[PDB]
A paper describes a structure:
Human leukocyte antigen ([name])-I molecules are of central importance in the presentation of antigenic peptides, enabling CD8+ T cells to eliminate cancerous and virally infected cells. However, [name]-I molecules can present extended peptides (>10 amino acids), whereby the N- and C-termini are similarly constrained within the [name]-I molecule, forcing the central region of the peptide to bulge from the Ag-binding cleft. NY-[name]-1 is an immunogenic cancer-testis antigen that is spontaneously expressed on a range of melanomas and other cancers including myelomas. To identify the principles underpinning extended peptide recognition, here we investigated TCR binding of an immunodominant NY-[name]-1 13-amino-acid peptide (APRGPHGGAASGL) derived from positions 60–72 of the cancer-testis antigen, NY-[name]-1.
Superimposition of the [name]*07:02 molecule onto the structure of [name]*07:02 bound to a nonameric RFL9 peptide48 illustrated little movement in the [name]-I molecule (root-mean-squared deviation (r.m.s.d.) of 0.2 Å), despite presenting distinct peptides. Given the anchored restraints at the peptide extremities, the central residues, encompassing P4-Gly→P11-Ser of the NY-[name]-160–72 peptide, bulged extensively out of the peptide-binding groove. Here, the solvent accessible surface area of the NY-[name]-160–72 peptide was double that of the RFL9 peptide (620 Å2 compared to 290 Å2), thereby providing an extended surface for TCR-mediated recognition. Taken together, these structures indicated that the NY-[name]-160–72 peptide was highly malleable prior to engagement by two cognate TCRs.
Numbering used by the authors:
A (entry chain C): 1 to 13
B (entry chain A): 1 to 275
C (entry chain B): 1 to 99
Write the structure that this text describes.
């Protein structure tokens, strides 16, 4: 299963 | 033996032709098992291997939400990258993401990966320690500083050591008939006259899985790397792979040439000759 | 920086005249991902050709498999025709069952 965005406003480049 | 799980994300901008397309494919070893495509009529994670079809509606729903969110995140990333390289809004660009885990026979984590490329070139990668990043250029250094500020690597590490390994273990269990099965190459040598004094010997390897294979020619027991034509390993469409290697040989000297095949489905390496 | 596609045209199984089989065109090593691939029977485009889901290699270059069911004969010529930004004209690779 893919990695979920639990962070989550900072996982972008 | 060793196994890997990998997700491959591709986001491609297309100014004037809508928002960027997001597509993800998931692999265990050389076996694709899921896909997602934002250009699909009703975008949803879809099964692409028989052993994943048993996952419940909760699985597909959760993962679908993850991909849609990721597509949005990637659109923001593409905007930022545009800025980082002083690029206009007119051109098309590509953001690729590749991540996952390698486990051994006991299912323990051997290695984690989490990296990115922009317009085909390495951009940033999580280091083997899963705690720090390597940036390829001054643009990626901005991403690096941002992710350090956010302690992003800790989330990546948590996935790689946790959920990634456990899902891979599960998939290996459920798909073991295929995923834990090596199919050895079927091999033969063909002979093709080039001219009165020369002919091609071509060594074939067909129907093998996984794709990793070593296929070499020797003349008098000496490797012929420079004089061997070696095609890229190619998919047959039935899960298996194909490859061949060819050498040009002087007429009458055919028996001095041997083809050597190494594959994990082969207990000992094969040695073949013409006829 | 762009990368031009490598192209291989080949059958799923060793070709036998009269026996059903699958004709493959494998395009790989290219960047960017947009690419157009046709399978040709005697110079004309084969309809409803399927392809794999877009994926890429460790060096970030893309690959796709295009495929269709075929029954090879000694008469019929098959080919793959590929277009990509890196190519000025379409590139045609003929199916040679020895390769």
């Amino acid at each position: 299963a893919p990695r979920g965005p639990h962070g989550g406003a900072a996982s972008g480049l | 033996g060793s196994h890997s799980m990998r997700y491959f994300y591709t986001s491609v901008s297309r100014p004037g032709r809508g928002e960027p397309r997001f597509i993800s494919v998931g692999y265990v070893d050389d076996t694709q098992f899921v896909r997602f495509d934002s250009d699909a009529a009703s975008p949803r994670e879809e099964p692409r291997a028989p052993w994943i079809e048993q996952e419940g509606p909760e699985y597909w729903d959760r993962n679908t939400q993850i991909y849609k969110a990721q597509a949005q995140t990637d659109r923001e990333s593409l905007r930022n990258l545009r800025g980082y390289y002083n690029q206009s809004e007119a051109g098309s660009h590509t953001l690729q993401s590749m991540y996952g885990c390698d486990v051994g026979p006991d299912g323990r984590l051997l290695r984690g990966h989490d990296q990115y490329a922009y317009d085909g070139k390495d951009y940033i990668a999580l280091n083997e320690d899963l705690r720090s990043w390597t940036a390829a250029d001054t643009a990626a250094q901005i991403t690096q500083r941002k992710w350090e500020a956010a302690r992003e690597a800790e989330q990546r590490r948590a996935y790689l050591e946790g959920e990634c390994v456990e899902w891979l273990r599960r998939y290996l269990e459920n798909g073991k008939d295929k995923l834990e099965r090596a199919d050895p190459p079927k091999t033969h040598v063909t002979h093709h006259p080039i001219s009165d004094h020369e002919a091609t010997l071509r060594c074939w390897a067909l129907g093998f899985y996984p794709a990793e294979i070593t296929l070499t020619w020797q003349r008098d027991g000496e490797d012929q790397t420079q004089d061997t034509e070696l095609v890229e390993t190619r998919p047959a469409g039935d899960r298996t792979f194909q490859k061949w290697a060819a050498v040009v040989v002087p007429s009458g000297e055919e028996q001095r040439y041997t083809c050597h095949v190494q594959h994990e489905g082969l207990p000992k390496p094969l040695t073949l000759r013409w006829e | 920086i762009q990368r031009t596609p490598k192209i291989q045209v080949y059958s799923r199984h060793p070709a036998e005249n009269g026996k059903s089989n699958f004709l493959n065109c494998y395009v790989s090593g290219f960047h960017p991902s947009d690419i157009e691939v046709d399978l040709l029977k005697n110079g004309e485009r084969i309809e409803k050709v399927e392809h794999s889901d877009l994926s890429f290699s460790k060096d970030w270059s893309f690959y796709l498999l295009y495929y269709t069911e075929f029954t090879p004969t000694e008469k019929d010529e098959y080919a793959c025709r590929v277009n990509h930004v890196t190519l000025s004209q379409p590139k045609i690779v003929k199916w040679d069952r020895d390769m």
